[PDB]
Each structure stands twice: as structure tokens, then as C-alpha cells.
Design a protein around this ligand. Structure first.
Ligand SMILES: CCC(CC)O[C@@H]1CC(C(=O)O)=C[C@@]2(SC(N)=NC2=O)[C@H]1NC(C)=O
Ligand SMILES: CCC(CC)O[C@@H]1CC(C(=O)O)=C[C@@]2(SC(N)=NC2=O)[C@H]1NC(C)=O
Ligand SMILES: CCC(CC)O[C@@H]1CC(C(=O)O)=C[C@@]2(SC(N)=NC2=O)[C@H]1NC(C)=O
Ligand SMILES: CCC(CC)O[C@@H]1CC(C(=O)O)=C[C@@]2(SC(N)=NC2=O)[C@H]1NC(C)=O
Ligand SMILES: [Ca+2]
Ligand SMILES: [Ca+2]
Ligand SMILES: [Ca+2]
Ligand SMILES: [Ca+2]
Lengths: 389, 389, 389, 389
């Protein structure tokens, strides 16, 4: 049976802790993959953490991080949410140095990108076997989102970028059924930049909050309809949520253009709430440290600066990183709306700390009907480690 | 299908060994979580051991026990009963430094408390996803039982405390269906103290034997009806079963008030048997060492001192700790009563032994129709360990 | 659905390798329980290896074998046949320093004996929970077989001994349905000795070949009918198959009495084949080294010395140990007879080798319609190990 | 339900990455079997990697590779495709120093060969238990293919060799249903040599591309019909694909005879594509390094040298090894043809590198409708390892 996912996103007043994997603390002694991107996606039976491994373990010499990001060894794997990315519980998914994954209600579909920068291949898997491919259309690091893709009534959707990471690139919507491409669309976005989209289903559409790695410190926003027509622009709110970024006071919002005139970025997310938005961001404006989520009244549709809620989940003394969106399937939450959820990656090691390696662990939060107090569910590993000596 | 759990508790003459996990002995070399509270709860398919981890492994530097009890890293996880709390067999349950869990016959419901002492959040999970929350109502370490909660005909019940741990606090009964709160009640108990309840279903009610951490060396007793009306008081028996406590000879029982005038305590349990009671306690009156279970004739309803049975399961040369109640589901035992069962936590390390760490393992016993001989199923680990050097 | 197991044992001309777990070789680096008695029993879905652990791992200090045989820590656990007794694949079964286990077609029934020598308790488990008990009836090390018990048409049968291990003891047949004792019988056997029976179903009866630890170098034989009437005696064959034992030439067989006048023994097995018997034994007459299986024509019913087949599975340069019987369920083999099968335990360490520890691994063989060549599937571990230094 | 496997092989323009296990990189720290032959075979539910272990782990002294190839310890085991051959995820299959395995749609059938060189035994397993045997018919190392066997409409087929490995030997087709031999055939092939066949189903027949270890640098080709009649010869293409071999320019193809006049070989594969063939081979003509797959137009039926496609998957700077064929079941791919797939073993250690041990890892590729760019998914382990010092 296909998941509908046609419902509204739940209006939430805050976010409750779902899981914490403690991967790096455990990896001090246990057998844990070195990873990045521990994103979460759910079937109607369970939620899983997906991740990119380098084929190496924490506290081992192969965790030497001199080896390139897009290596022959990178592979998408997964465990149940809350479990560490340990070897002995891991399900293999795809060969990938960039990835996305989602469930249509019957099976898991994953997409793994590997191969050379100049001509990469994305391999779509469905139910445990490859079913289709997408080759690089523009010859420059074909790449996906690094979070959950989005299945609505049996058809699944995701966004891909091919081209420069610090200039104008090319962006495409892909649609598949049962692991087979049934439609695609070019995203016209001159002046704009789209990387690493965080999507969720809402009102029968796919909504995505992405990363501008060119000039924007506000986040691009894509709203995809089932027929592949779309709306694209920026998160209207007059508060920047990318990193690096300037102060809130020095920012004017925009629904259409990138603002802030800064390079770089970090993958992030946001949730529409009628006309409001929940927006994640690191606490530091310059570093990937701390994590907070703000509700901006009318921030989805207006250049609003009306901040009505603020919740801290990782304090500014602690390293964060990537963040992404997913929803709880109706079959699991028991609700008649789509509970909005996010994961926060917590990066340990290089370049901020004195080790030969880099990994991350995660905390996952789910939208609830109540205000939830500030705290810090930080990584907690004690660095440096044994191999670092 | 919901479990009825409307049956009488079985009248038992003694207790047979169910399981022993040997976690710490195994953790000398294997990959085992450092834990506390290895409580047991059963679905109609199996019984699982739940536990609190600190995100660290035995024989690893992160097992340094200087890190606070209620830390960002603590997480409720579980394995099948008898298995060590090893990483590679563990199911993730909830972020929690205090917890309870039980099965309604369809799915597992768990409750995990985390967040700051002044404003803690309890996150209810049902079928693997968070479904509801309870925030601290009195601002002082919201906390649950650390043993199995209790599901009767599809509705599940548990007790929570918020407030001082050595003075008058506030106590509440919570009721949920399918992970959603459908009722609650304040427990009026002036002069009394309720911590860490050990509950079981009996005659269509929930009966709880708890821990008075204020002045009582006898144990408080709560009897909860489905409509949330209740009876609360103390275990009538003229024999104290908390720790620390005085000698039996210097004790007068009470059905209504705390007796003994001593602070502190340890989580424990008892089982109604008509008007008799089975009561667990450590053998030492001052230390958490040894474990014995006594049957007191008319000890549930009278200030009785008539001890008619005594069974030792952990000798006084060996460390014990927490103890808690659960029942065998009718679907598993094949009986028409609810087989009463308990677990005994066996704490190793600080503060009694010369190590940097603290963990525990467990032995689980189930009520049988026969007298069972004294023995000692103690932890057995050889301390100190490698990191302790 | 209950297994019938009412069929004839298959007539076989030899034995084919089923599995080898390589536990000790793997345990040089992996996380493997120290064990003894790796017996095999099958459900209609799979065959599992059961074993006794001491709660310790190979290459760890807790594997120090100074700790008593019948310790508080011993526990019955299991894995699928061919898998090493590693921690992370192990299913917990029972607290036990002596054990038996079998499947009735619906669930697993196990029996674990633990507690003090003077008053031991045997706890019967059914479907993962304890369901019944047997206390020591004669006060001297209550104990079972250490191999598969036997289920026929839903009722399961096993043999137990209580009393001296080197003199006249007491022996009993037990019968259970769904983990509940429904019948028992005393075995009258003056002059005889029964230990560690290896049973299988055949023609609607349970046949057992056991170990005389008193004076017999031939093996006692018990044939149990469903109503608990029985036939008891010795394996008629004029060839001794216990260890230690004398030469074949110096032996006269007996159907009724122990022959050989020697103490000690080793658990072993045999299979009726019409009037023939397959009999296992170590190759050495004095040591537990080597393993061979002989077919003696008319050896079940006559003092025959007519040896018609001989197959070696472990050469005399290599350590063996215990051996036991089980059958392939009809639902798995696809046959209309009960394929006879055995396991050979291979003991490494003390007292024969220079280590602080003792464990064993196994090879499992199944009866086939063809003559199978001699070879040696010995343990293969390289001793001593790391902790031994 | 039996798998049909009566469909045509899909015509493919190239091959997409399916999985990479990274076993040796992981085995630097994790608990990974030392293996060879990581072949892949699929049920309608999943694809598994099968492998031969020596009962030892990477980075352990038992991985000393002085121990013979056909040892008492070798055992066929399996994991899901993409997973490392780690202990704690491994399913035991058979005792074997040579093996094959395939799924008929209901259960797994495996065949494991063990025992002495002069009189080996092959034990057929079906659904987890041995069901039949084949003894050596010619007394000289009975042996199978080391890749997936082939099930068509419930009957499974495989090729076996018995006799010299560098001269004329004897070759046989075996056919089984439900693990029971129902037919066999001798392969008449004077002057020819057949080893280690790589088979797949195509048009209702089994097609096999094998290894001539006698004089052929081209590969023998066997086409088996359900009634055991067959066609046997050499891959017609005028391009040699065994290793060692000469240059392409110095080669004339043959449909009937071995060409090249060289000894030795390596297991390989090829796929019929109408009259074309996809042929795998190492890049080096003399070493097992690099891996490429070529499409030769009319190369199945003619001495063609018309190379129309070439795809590199392992570069010539990196070690390869064995390679083998399997297909995606229709139930998994969703197609109406049989997606052709292969695995490439990547051997690390002796004799090419300075270590005491030898293992391999793998990359698996599946046929797709698009041209896929050259890359190198090599093993990646950093040698030597810890025990090598
Ligand atoms: C701008 C996003 C992307 C463009 C190539 O680059 C990712 C940046 C980045 C980071 O931590 O900021 C980490 C990434 S996320 C990923 N898959 N691996 C990375 O190292 C970069 N992505 C790729 C495919 O190289
Ligand atoms: C009186 C029970 C409770 C009150 C805060 O304190 C627990 C005492 C205690 C002990 O071993 O005695 C261990 C506990 S049980 C638990 N969850 N962790 C602990 O360290 C204390 N509970 C909390 C939430 O901090
Ligand atoms: C004669 C069988 C039994 C009588 C107490 O003693 C077993 C002998 C023995 C051996 O290797 O010979 C090993 C055993 S088998 C087992 N369960 N553990 C052992 O150490 C002995 N059994 C007991 C319950 O102590
Ligand atoms: C020619 C194939 C076979 C003939 C005995 O010998 C295999 C050669 C070989 C190699 O890497 O080239 C490795 C093999 S494949 C295998 N099962 N083990 C090996 O060591 C050889 N096979 C046997 C049964 O010994
Ligand atoms: Ca940016
Ligand atoms: Ca107290
Ligand atoms: Ca004897
Ligand atoms: Ca050759």
C-alpha cells in the first residue's frame, strides 16, 4: 500500500527529543563507521538513519581524513533511528558520496551518486536492487540533497544539482515510481543557487528549503507540484538562517532573491506553518556550532522579523553541522497531519579539533503541541582519540 | 489485539531463575553499554530488558563516571531478556535519564525523560515514534519509575514525581492509549513520599510498591483504578523493606504512614498475594548488598510480622541494587493468572569499589508453584578492569 | 502445528558434513563465549546450536577456568547451526549449568538446571518464558542430558539423573506438553548408571544412548514409550564405545549389564538401524581425541562384533569430546524418515593444553545414503592464546 | 512459488555500481572473515554475497596464509550484498573449500565441497539442511564454480569438475530439485578444459562462461538445456579474456577450440547479448589487476574483433581477481528481462603484497540502459596491517 502523504504539516509549538545515537562516544571502543550526513527517513513501519561511510571505523588508521570526500569507498548505509552507525547493525544501501532516500509505503527507494566528478552516475535503488540511472547532465559533480526525499501517493520526488558549487549551477527536479524515472524538470533560477535540499510533503506538494552556496545567507525555497510545475525563490523571512551569515539587524528579507552577499553555506531546513515558518540555524553566525529553531510569524510569505518562538537543542559551546527535514508517516504517529521532524548532525574532528579524522553523530527532534525547554543534546565525545596519538 | 491483563496475580510459593545477562563479565572484553536500571517488561511475544546507557562502553574512557546522572547522553535502549546490553543487539527507545516502558498487546509504549532539571520533558513513544509529551509541572526533576509500566485492556498507566527527593514532593498518575495521554490524576500524600514505583496489574487494577526517600523505611503502596481514583498508603507489614533501614525487631508496621524515620532509599517491589505480600529487600540493612524475598502472611492488609517464607537469590557478600516488578502475559505463560516476576539489578563499581566507572547486570526471577532453594546468582565480574589502571 | 516425529530413523550408509562453527579460531580475535556442550536441536524451520557459557569471552581474564563448573554464571544460550557462539548473534535461553532443549513444532522448550548441588532447580522454558519447575528429588546435583530432547506429536521427553556420579544414582523420565510437566517415571536400574542421554525419536518411541560413569565402558540404552513404560539396558554390541575403555578384543558385549569394569566416561550417542547400530566413539581408548562412527551389524539386538562400516570425522591427532544425537525434522529434509544426525564437540585447553581456559567448537554431520570418505574436521585453533601469556 | 527465470537477458549499454563491501578496510579494526570468492546470488527478496572463510579474522594470527587452500576449516557463509563478511551478520551455509549457491524462488540451495583431495564430498543444502550428496567421481579435487548456480522453473543446475587442473579433466552438469539430484550429464570436451563456471539463465537455458586452466586464453562456453543436452565450445570472439593471456592483435578467435597456448587462468564471466557478448577481463594481460568489460559485436557467434563498448570499473593500478555472473530476479527489478549482473573480487595480500595473509573485497555492478563512465571502485585497504608487524 502506498503512503498518501497528502496531509497538512502539523502546526507545532516546539520540538521533543526523538533519538540520539551517541555514535562517536560509542566509537571510542566499539566498531562504528566514520560518517557524515546522518539523515532520517521513515517508512510506515519505522524511521531509519541513513549515512555516508568511508569504509572505515573510528579509532582506526583508515579513518585518516586525508582521503577525498568523493572517494571510491564512500557508501550509503542505514540503521534504525537512534542506533549508532555500527557495522553489525548496518543495512547496505548504495555506492554513494552523495545521496537521498525515502519510502513510498511499499518499499525503500534510494539514490546514490558515485563515479568521476566530470561524469558522475546516480543509481536509483528500489527494494534493495538498482532499478534506474541518471548520469551527470552538466559534467560537474552531479549531487543530491543528503536528506530524506519525498513520496506522495506512490510517486517520489527529489532535487539534484550539477555544476559549480560557488557560482551559477544547474538544478533539476526528478520524479520516480517504483525506482523508475517517470518525469523530470529543469529549475530556472538565474542569480540563484540550490544545494542539498531539505524537503517534506505538505498539502499534496513537496516543499524544500535548501542551501545557497553562492551569495545567499537566506535559504532558497522550492515548492513542487505533482506535475513538475514548481515555484522557486527564497524563504521570505527577514532573518537569515544559513552559515556563515550576518547579524539579524543588518538583514532585509526577500521572497525572490539571495540576500547577504556571502559565500559558503551549510545544509539546513525549515517548516511552513500556514504562513509562519520554523527555521533551523546554527547559533554562531560564522561557525557550525550550536543549534536553534525559530518560529517567524508570516515568515513563509512575508519579509517578517516577528520572532514568536525560539528553542535551543544544541548550545553554542558545542559543534553542530548539517540539518534536515522529514515527516512522521500518518500510519505511525496516528495523526491526521504530517508531524514535522528534523535531525541535527554534530561534527567532531577536523578542521576544528586536533585529530586525524572527522565524523558526526546526531539528535532527532519531532514537532509537538507544546513548548519545549532549551537544552543541549550535544555529541559528547572526548577528543582527541587513541589513533590521534 | 490488546492484552486484557485483568486477571489475578498468581499465588506463588517461590521464585525460579528466568535469566542472567552477565553484562559486566562479558563487558570485560565485549562491547557493552555502561548502564543502570535493567528493568524487564513483556509483550505477548517476548520479554525485554530495558536500560539506561550513558552512550559509553565498559573498559572505555567515556565510562568515566564523573559525568552527571542526568546527562545529555543518557538514552533508553533494550535487548531481549537474558542478553547483555551490548551495542549490536540493542534497540533504541528514547532519550532518557529516567524512564518507563510497557506493551499494550499491539505495540510498545515507552516514556523517556530528558532536558533540564528545572523544566524537564517526558516524551512518550508508541510503536517506535514519539506520540505525546509531558512537561515538568513543578520544575524539579520530573521523573518516572525505572521499571515496567502497566497496560490493562489497551490503556497504560504510570506514576511520576516532580519536586524534592528528600522532602515533600508532588506525585501523579498518568494514563495513555496508543501513546496519547487520555487522563491524569494528582496523588494527595501529605507527609508521604513517592519515588520509582514498581507496578503490576492485579484484579483489574494497577498495584504499585514504591520508594519513600524522605522518612520511610517501609514502602508506599498505590492502588490505581481505571478511572484514576486510587488508594495510597504504606505496605501494612510490620517488616521494613527499604534500604537503609533499622532492624525488624525495632519496627512497628503501618498501613497509612511512613515509619522508621530514616532518609534515603532504594527502588524496590512487592507482590500482593490475597492478603499476604511478597516483599523484596537487600540483605544488608545499610548497604545495597544481598537480595532476599519474604512472604509476610496478611502483610498487605495488616501490621503483620508473620514471616512464612524466605528465599535468597543474591548473598550478602555480593552487591545488589534496584529491584522491580513485572508480570508474564497470559499469552506467554499459558496460565489464567498473572505470573508475578522481578528483576534484581547488581551494581558494580563506584562508590563501593576501586574503579572509575559504575554499571550493573541483572538476574530475573519468576513466580512458581514450588519452594525454591537459596542460592546466589551474583554479578561475578572481576574488578578492577583495564581502564581502571 | 505439532511435529509428528513418528517416523522411522533413516537407514544411512554414512555421514555428510552439515556445519562447523570454528568458534575458537574466530575467538582468537572476535567476541566469542567460552563454552562446553555445543549440542544441536531442530525446529521445522531451522537447526540451532545450544551451549553453556560461563558469562565470559575467549582471550579475556574471566575465561580463567579456575571457576567451578556449576557456577552462578553459567547460562544456556543458542545460535543457528554453524555460527560461532558469539555474543552478538546469541539468543538467551535459560540459567543453567546443565541443560536440554527441543522443539515441539510450535515453540522451543528448554530446561535449565541451576542452584546449589544439594537442592538444584530445573526450570522449564517454553516459548521464551519459564513455565514449570523440577526440584532435585535426591539432593545430589540434579542434571539433564546436554543434548537435544525429543518431541513426539506435541509431547516432549527427557531423562534426568540425581545422585552420585561414580556410584548408584537415581534416574527419571520426564514428559511435558507446552512447557508443563504432564508425567514422569522412575527408571529402575540397579547396578546400572545413566548420565547425559543422547536421544532421538524412532518408530513412535524415544531411544536413548547414554553414559555409564560407574563401571560401564559400554553404553546404557533406554527406549521410552509415550505412556512412560520403558525398556532399559545396555547397547548389545560386543564393541565398547565409551571413553576410557579397553580394547575391542578384550570385550564381550551385553544387552543387560555394564561391561568393562572401568570408571569415568564421556557423553556419546548411537543410532538404531533396524537391528544394526551406528555407534560413535573417540579413537583413543583413554583420551578424548579423534572421533569415529562404526556400524555394527545386529549390534542393537545382539552381542555382535560384525563391523561393516567405519567413518572417521576427527583424526586421533586432534581433541574431541562430547557427542550427541538429534534428527532432521521431516518438514526440512523433505523425507519420510527421520534423518539421523550428530554433533562432535572439540575441546581445547585445560587439562590437555597449556592455557588458563577451556572451550570447545563443533562439527555436525548428517546421515546420508552414501559412503563418505575419512577426513578430519578438527577445531584448528592455534594454542596458547594471548591471555595465556 | 518457483522463479520462472525463462526470460531473455536484458540488452544493456553499460553497468551501474550496485554495492561495495569495503571488507578489508573495515577489517583493519572490525571483526571480518578472511575470505575469497565473494560471489553474489539473488532470491526474489534479496541478493546475498556468499564467500569462503578460513575460520579466521583479519588482523589475527589465524589469518596466517600458510594454511592450505582446501583446509578442514573452510566454510561457506553469506551476508546481504554490500555488507562486509563480518562475523556478526553472517549466515552459515556449508562446510566448503569450493562452492556454489542459488535460489529457486522458495528456498536457497547451496552446494559445499569438502573432504580429502582423493575422495571429496559435495553436500547439497536446501532450506538450511543438507539434503543430498555427490562424491568425487574421478578422485582428483571434486570442485564447483565459485559463483551463483542457476534455477529455472524450480530446477537448479550447476557445473562440476573432477581431475587435473592443468591437463584434461572431467566435467559434469548436475540438476537438482528441492536439494535432491534428479539428473546429471557428462560433458564431452577432449582438448578442452572447464573450471569455475559463471552461469546465468537466458531464453530458458543456462549459459556458462568458464575458465580453461590448461591451454586456453579464451573462455569455454557451455549452453545447457533443461533435458541436460548441451552445447559446449569456446567464446567465439577474436579477443582473449582470461589471465594470463597475449595481446589482442596476436589472437585469432575460435568457437570450438582453445587458443593462445598458455597455462593458468582466472575465473571470469561473459554475457550473451543476442549475438554480441559482454566480456569481463583484468586490464593487465599477466596480472590480476584492473578490471574492464568489453562489448564485442557478434562476439558470441563469430570470431569478431569489433569492439563497440569499453567500461573500466577497477583501474590497472589496483588488484582485481575472480569475477562472476548472476541475474536480478524479475520479482525485484520489475523488468520483463533478466538484468545481467557481475561481481569483481579484489584480492589483497599474498602473493603480491608484503603480508602474512590474503583476502578480498568486492564491487557489484548491474546492467543498465545507459553508457556508464570509467572509474575505479578499488579495494582501498592500506597495507600492510597490524599482524604483519
Ligand atoms: C555545497 C554542497 C556540496 C557541493 C559540491 O558540497 C558539500 C559540502 C560539504 C560541507 O560539509 O559543507 C560536504 C559534502 S556533503 C557530502 N556528500 N560530502 C561532502 O563532503 C559536500 N558534498 C560533496 C558531494 O562533495
Ligand atoms: C530518589 C530517586 C531519584 C530522585 C531524583 O534519584 C535516583 C536515585 C538513584 C539511586 O541509585 O539511588 C539513581 C537514579 S535512577 C536514575 N534514573 N538515575 C539515577 O542516578 C536517580 N534518579 C535520577 C532521575 O537522577
Ligand atoms: C557424569 C556427567 C556429569 C555428572 C555430574 O558430570 C559432567 C562431566 C563433565 C565432563 O566433561 O566429563 C562435564 C560436565 S557437563 C556439564 N554440564 N558441565 C560439566 O562440567 C559435568 N556435568 C556437571 C553437571 O557438572
Ligand atoms: C583452476 C581452479 C581450481 C582448480 C583446482 O583451483 C582454484 C585456483 C585458485 C585461484 O585463485 O586461481 C583458487 C582456488 S578457488 C577456491 N575454492 N580456492 C582456491 O584456492 C582454487 N580452487 C581450489 C578448489 O583449490
Ligand atoms: Ca550560503
Ligand atoms: Ca527510604
Ligand atoms: Ca564409562
Ligand atoms: Ca587460461
Amino acid at each position: 500500500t502506498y503512503m498518501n502523504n497528502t496531509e497538512a504539516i502539523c502546526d507545532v509549538k516546539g520540538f521533543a527529543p526523538f533519538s540520539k545515537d551517541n555514535g562517536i562516544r560509542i566509537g571510542s571502543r566499539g566498531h562504528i563507521f566514520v560518517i557524515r550526513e546522518p539523515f532520517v527517513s521513515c517508512s510506515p513501519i519505522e524511521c531509519r538513519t541513513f549515512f555516508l561511510t568511508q569504509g572505515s571505523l573510528l579509532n582506526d588508521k583508515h579513518s585518516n581524513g586525508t582521503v577525498k570526500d568523493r572517494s571510491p569507498f564512500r557508501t550509503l548505509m542505514s540503521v534504525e533511528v537512534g542506533q549508532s552507525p555500527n557495522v553489525y547493525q548496518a543495512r547496505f544501501e548504495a555506492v554513494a558520496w552523495s545521496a537521498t532516500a525515502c519510502h513510498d509505503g511499499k518499499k525503500w527507494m534510494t539514490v546514490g551518486v558515485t563515479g568521476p566528478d566530470s561524469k558522475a552516475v546516480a543509481v536509483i535503488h528500489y527494494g534493495g536492487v538498482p532499478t534506474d540511472v541518471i548520469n551527470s547532465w552538466a559534467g560537474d559533480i552531479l549531487r543530491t540533497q543528503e536528506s530524506s526525499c519525498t513520496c506522495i501517493q506512490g510517486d517520489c520526488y527529489w532535487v539534484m544539482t550539477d555544476g559549480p558549487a560557488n557560482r551559477q549551477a544547474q538544478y533539476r527536479i526528478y520524479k520516480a515510481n517504483q525506482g523508475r524515472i517517470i518525469g523530470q524538470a529543469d529549475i530556472s533560477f538565474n542569480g540563484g543557487h540550490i544545494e542539498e535540499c531539505s524537503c517534506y510533503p505538505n498539502d499534496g506538494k513537496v516543499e524544500c528549503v535548501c542551501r545557497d552556496n553562492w551569495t545567499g545567507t537566506n535559504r532558497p525555497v522550492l515548492v513542487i507540484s505533482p506535475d513538475l510545475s514548481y515555484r522557486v525563490g527564497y524563504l521570505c523571512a527577514g532573518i537569515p538562517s544559513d552559515t556563515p551569515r550576518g547579524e539579524d539587524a543588518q538583514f532585509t528579507g526577500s521572497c525572490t532573491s539571495p540576500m547577504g552577499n556571502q559565500g559558503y553555506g551549510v545544509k539546513g531546513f525549515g517548516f511552513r506553518q500556514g504562513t509562519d515558518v520554523w527555521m533551523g540555524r546554527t547559533i554562531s553566525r560564522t561557525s557550525r556550532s550550536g543549534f536553534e529553531i525559530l518560529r517567524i510569524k508570516n515568515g513563509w510569505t512575508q519579509t517578517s522579523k516577528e520572532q514568536i518562538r525560539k528553542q535551543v537543542v544544541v548550545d553554542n559551546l558545542n559543534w553542530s553541522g548539517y540539518s534536515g527535514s522529514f515527516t512522521l508517516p500518518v500510519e505511525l504517529s496516528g495523526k491526521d497531519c504530517l508531524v514535522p521532524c528534523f535531525w541535527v548532525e554534530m561534527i567532531r574532528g577536523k578542521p576544528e579539533e586536533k585529530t586525524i579524522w572527522t565524523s558526526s553523530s546526531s539528535i532527532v527532534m519531532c514537532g509537538v503541541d507544546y513548548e519545549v525547554a532549551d537544552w543541549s543534546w550535544h555529541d559528547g565525545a572526548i577528543l582527541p582519540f587513541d589513533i590521534d596519538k
